[PDB]
Amino acid sequence: DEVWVVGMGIVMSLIVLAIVFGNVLVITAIAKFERLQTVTNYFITSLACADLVMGLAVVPFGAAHILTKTWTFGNFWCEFWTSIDVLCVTASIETLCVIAVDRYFAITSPFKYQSLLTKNKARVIILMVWIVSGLTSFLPIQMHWYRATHQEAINCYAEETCCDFFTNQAYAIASSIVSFYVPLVIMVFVYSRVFQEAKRQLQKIDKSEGRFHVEHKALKTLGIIMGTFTLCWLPFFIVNIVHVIQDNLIRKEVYILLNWIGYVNSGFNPLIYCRSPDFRIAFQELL
Ligand SMILES: CN[C@@H]1CCc2c(ccc(O)c2O)[C@H]1O
């Protein structure tokens, strides 16, 4: 009466369904209606594209790998799958930073905002983000610049039915730095400044109209924005650093679980970044 195959399969299918449904809905809502076509919504389009590619490509095959315990395809497909996984992850995480910086420049520089950011510059920014994402993903993995040296790694690399992730110290550290830490620092600085500006505005209003009845909301919005990202992706990169720093500190199952915890963050992005009333009207019209 085992339920391992049935129990995990249902949840794994449900995650794919949720990700694909949400991202397709967001993409078609932005594309079909001319009201929602805005410079800010291009970054949302890029993030939705990255998460949709993730949900269609990396999750279904990882599900088969976990359920079956063998890689029925060749080594070339294993390398391609690893490359596309890294590409999608880094592209999404960097697009989040781009959105944060966009909001920073919108709020802290109101008079000059319409000047420095034009619809032409957004295309260049998105192209640069995707190119940088592709440089760290396909170039090192496809040229065997990330491979390990120990006997277990060699045996895994020399077998067609095994597909496991083995990496050396330099690639792991560089990939973690490029993918996670710099965007995290930039987002922290940006959102701290935004919170300061909001508090200053509230204090300004209070002095002017305090007598008549005329920061919970800002704290709630910043918490919803930051806590989910931190909880989803912070645990994984710490163990990513440790497992090459320390040989036998961390088991493989913990690594896989913490990797899969970060995958579900793609299904939450429509809930966080697409709650605008215009988006709700568009969703009502489509469905
Ligand atoms: C096989 N899973 C990979 C392993 C390493 C890695 C991931 C994502 C982003 C990175 O920058 C990485 O270095 C994970 O998705």
Curated annotation (Swiss-Prot):
The modification Phosphotyrosine is found at Y113. (S)-carazolol binds at D85, S175, N259. GO terms for cellular component: apical plasma membrane; ciliary basal body; cilium; clathrin-coated endocytic vesicle membrane; early endosome; endosome; endosome membrane; Golgi apparatus. Residues 68-78, 147-168, 246-252 are extracellular. Residues 31-43, 102-122 are cytoplasmic. Its main location: membrane. Beta-adrenergic receptors mediate the catecholamine-induced activation of adenylate cyclase through the action of G proteins. The beta-2-adrenergic receptor binds epinephrine with an approximately 30-fold greater affinity than it does norepinephrine. This is Beta-2 adrenergic receptor. It comes from Homo sapiens. The chain holds residues 29 to 340 of 413 of the full protein.
